[PDB]
Amino acid sequence: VTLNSQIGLSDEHVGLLGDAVVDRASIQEANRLLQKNHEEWHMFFRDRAGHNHIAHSILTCLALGAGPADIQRAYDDGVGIQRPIPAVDGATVERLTDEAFFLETLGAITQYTSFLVFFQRQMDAHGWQAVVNKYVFSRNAIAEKMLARLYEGAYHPVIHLGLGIEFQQPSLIAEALAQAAAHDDSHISRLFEACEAQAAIAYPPAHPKPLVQLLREARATEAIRSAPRWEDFGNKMRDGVVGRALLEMAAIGSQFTVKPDERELQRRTAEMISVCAYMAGASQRPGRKRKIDFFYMHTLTSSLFFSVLIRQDWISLADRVRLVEWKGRLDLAWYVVSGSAELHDDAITDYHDDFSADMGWKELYAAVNKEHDDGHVAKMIRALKNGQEAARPFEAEYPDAFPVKGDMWLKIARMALDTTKDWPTDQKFVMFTGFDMGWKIRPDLA
Amino acid sequence: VTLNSQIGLSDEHVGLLGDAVVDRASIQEANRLLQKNHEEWHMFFRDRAGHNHIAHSILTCLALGAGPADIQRAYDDGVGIQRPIPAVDGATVERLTDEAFFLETLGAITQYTSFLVFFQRQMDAHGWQAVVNKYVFSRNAIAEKMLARLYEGAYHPVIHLGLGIEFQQPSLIAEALAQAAAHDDSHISRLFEACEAQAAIAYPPAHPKPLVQLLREARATEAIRSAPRWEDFGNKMRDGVVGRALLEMAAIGSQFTVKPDERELQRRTAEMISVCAYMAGASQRPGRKRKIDFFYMHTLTSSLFFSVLIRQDWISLADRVRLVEWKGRLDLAWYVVSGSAELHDDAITDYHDDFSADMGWKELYAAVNKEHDDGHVAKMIRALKNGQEAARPFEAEYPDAFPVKGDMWLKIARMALDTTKDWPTDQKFVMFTGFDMGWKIRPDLA
Ligand SMILES: [Fe+3]
Ligand SMILES: [Fe+3]
DSSP: OOTTTSOOOOSSSOOSSOOSOOOHHHHHHHHHHHHHHHHTBOSOSSSSSOOOTHHHHHHHHHHTTOOHHHHHHHHHHHHTTOOBOOOOOHHHHHHTTSHHHHHHHTTOGGGHHHHHHHHHHHHHHHOHHHHHHHHTSSOSHHHHHHHHHHTHHHHOHHHHHHHHHHTTOHHHHHHHHHHHHTOOOOSTHHHHHHHHHHHHHSOOOSSOOOHHHHHHHHHHOHHHHTSOOTTTGGGGIIIIIHHHSHHHHHHHHHTOOOOSOHHHHHHHHHHHHHHHHHHHHSOOOBTBOOOOBTTHHHHHHHHHHHHHHHHOTTSOHHHHHHHHHHHHHHHHHHHHHTTOOOOOTHHHHSOOOGGGSSOOHHHHHHHHHHSOSSSHHHHHHHHHHHHHHHHHHHHTTOTTSOSSOTTHHHHHHHHHHHTTTTSOTTTSSBSOTTSHHHHHSOSSOO | OOSTTSOOOOSSSOOSSOOSOOOHHHHHHHHHHHHHHHHTBOSOSSSSSOOOTHHHHHHHHHHTTOOHHHHHHHHHHHTTTOOBOOOOOHHHHHHTTSHHHHHHHTTOGGGHHHHHHHHHHHHHHHOHHHHHHHHTTTOSHHHHHHHHHHTHHHHOHHHHHHHHHHTTOHHHHHHHHHHHHSSOOOSTHHHHHHHHHHHHHSOOOSSOOOHHHHHHHHHHOHHHHTSOOTTTGGGGIIIIIHHHSHHHHHHHHTTOOOOSOHHHHHHHHHHHHHHHHHHHHSOOOBTBOOOOBTTHHHHHHTHHHHHHHTTOTTSOHHHHHHHHHHHHHHHHHHHHHTTOOOOOTHHHHSOOOGGGSSOOHHHHHHHHTTSOSSSHHHHHHHHHHHHHHHSHHHHTTOTTSOSSOTTHHHHHHHHHHHHHTTSOTTSSSBSOSSSTHHHHSOTTOO
16 A cells, blocks of 8 residues: 555646536545556456546546536446456566566566556656656667557557546556556557658658648558458458558658647647547548547547646657657558548538537536446547647647637537437447448448 | 868869859858858758758859859758757867777767867868878778768768868868768778778779679669668668678679779769769659659769869879779669669650750759759759769760760759759659659659
């Protein structure tokens, strides 16, 4: 029992946004449940596509004005699928200090408990800021591995990492570092390194291209669009993009360069958020019902937490610039993984539905704090608010790099609640909306 | 503030070519901008492929008949990417007299200012002719490391040096010796030495083979054509040519020897100039557009500065031949790095475009002095002039070693202006034309 491994929320740094009052009984109700999830349940409930969203739903719902029972609502929904946490092999723990052992242990889902004990015990020594800036931002072998593993599994470790920095809870930061260390490899490091590779020789992008301009250039490149197959299934990123369209995707991804200025870093960070929302909202089929993509939304949810990192004064700006660059390049990969679906602006500009035809951010916050899900729909509307705010200082100055502007933000958030209400968790979203097969076999899609 | 460290231009030696009248206001205008670049901006703006062409563009444009507002143009266009010059570490400076410290400090980009201060203070002592003939042509440990470093990075340090000996400004010669000292190593030394190595045991090339003959045999050698890969990217030379085809490529380059005659020195110097222009003008794709290669064009821009060296009386003739020798042996390595693109004479004999179908050397000079570029296209046309004149007394006697002859010199200089007018600096040339990847991912190539 250490002060780090205890999850204690404080009414001081509670929410990046801060546009909602938090019922104080939730904070005592949240910590009580956050501690259970911290020492009872496995982070990975399956080996593949397994993530313990219990903490993410409890935290994000809170920052949107959650009640007491609404916090219990998040724990009760995601515990029905939750599996117990492995034991801690103390031999691995004491051995994880040797650089040779830490690398050979990476990829062990069953060793998550051991990695958590290690990062917690190392945080009790040099602090949560020193651990991250030597296991993530350090440019040595373990860093250049753990850093890519934060983007693994649809940016789920880097979402865990961002929350622990938002509410300042080193126990959470320990989990994210352990989650990234016990993740199966998706070969996405091979894409990150190649993208920063020809970003050296190829010079110079005098006028940096908008990220949306690279999205269109991606879909036209048939080798990229043809890289994912419905037969690849879970290994669309491993045995598809990275496996077939590596050299080609890196050619598009490399052209996304963030100049090392702070306003420029804020500028391009918002560009990624407008693109992510544009991806989840404009991936609709003319003629069919509106429905969001399960992996396009994960590009959006994670965008909010990259605004957390660029504000941290304890990360180097090159690393802060590196986090947005690696973010934007891996998004163009996921856009192809879902099927590179066609994005037209008419669906988001012309969207109406009586249920939320006049709801505001607050009403959406309220209506989302009570609905039963894994927390995904909540995180969407939370990021779309942040995307609206962080883009506005720049929205008018470059209208060609921001496809989502002004009122489109609220529209997408409304579409997020409409298309997932009165639907089970399995049938809320679609998996791979760019694949015509994804809509055929599903009956609820019509 | 020393007389050597002050860039003062005179109307006595203003251009190796000298076939253009120079607006005398430009000389005063060029001197006010070369000094800023001499004491404000870093020689390397990035660690890899980073070079300060501001001095190169201002110098070449001036000798081409630049006006006052055209000298400012070159500075105005290159300063946007420039980064601040590092500080000088005085301990390094005072310790740079010890041979051991000099050898350990090499390769430190952050110590360019320190090397520049050391080479300037040594030129204030024994002169500019004495500093170079003891740190370059001295056959000791340092000079043989620095000489191979003068060819690093596509002959850019020797481009600075050639510009320093041409206009007689010891401040520029200091920057060139400090740029080659602070350069990263591409392992091209291990190719230079193995070139001269079997150029001793193996004997004797009775009738020396032309340099266009060694190109073709190097492309047929599948073990040389296959060493560079698209994944190697930046380090195509370090971890590709020398990394894989060191022993092989050394068998081709060593056959390029220069007999120590003085007419043989200018006959083999002009043969390199015609071989280089043959690489940048014939590297086209039958069916696709016309566009030069970014590294083949660098082999031609440097040929003029090797015409500055063989005329220097203060360099020994044995050292003036080894320069042309090493130059010709590294040019063979760059033909392979770009991809050993097929060179067919038809592309430079049947070249027509209305924009410059009838332009002479005086109009190309006029138009290139007003086009906004890094200075590469102005320096292409200038080297083809020096190549037309110095190859003319040898063109007809050996028509089998001058693949570009007569009117072909003027067709390539037109080709430079057309394919690089109306293009941003990033899209003026292609990077690696022998690789099919280089033409696929670029949309402008059609
Ligand atoms: Fe998720
Ligand atoms: Fe250059």
